[PDB]
Design a protein around this ligand. Structure first.
Ligand SMILES: *[C@@H]1O[C@H](CO)[C@@H](O)[C@H](O)[C@H]1NC(C)=O
Lengths: 48, 48
């Protein structure tokens, strides 16, 4: 985390710096998207 | 001279009130912003 670390979360691949988030997903929510319709928030499959 | 001064002051007050009252009077400027920003949005949408 906190580095340029490629990530493959449940088959969703991307590149970026992972940081702790303050957003509150709904219980079923998995992926988060921004105004740009691009992945900006993710949920770790192992730890909620 | 006095009549002209009074007319000028009244006219400038009326212009102040008219600007404070009509919202669309500044459209010639507003649309500029309302163009440029939205254009960017469309560009970003192309990423999806
Ligand atoms: C997966 O396992 C870890 C420990 O092995 C546990 O902490 C975590 O809660 C588990 N995930 C789920 C969704 O239960």
């Amino acid at each position: 985390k906190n580095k340029c670390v490629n990530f493959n979360f449940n088959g969703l691949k991307g590149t970026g710096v992972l940081t702790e988030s303050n957003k509150k997903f709904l219980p079923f929510q998995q992926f988060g998207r921004d105004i740009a319709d691009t992945t900006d928030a993710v949920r770790d499959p192992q730890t909620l | 001279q006095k009549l002209i001064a009074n007319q000028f002051n009244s006219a400038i007050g009326k212009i102040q009130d008219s600007l404070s009252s009509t919202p669309s009077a500044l459209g010639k400027l507003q649309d500029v912003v309302n163009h440029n920003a939205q254009a960017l949005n469309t560009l970003v949408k192309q990423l999806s």
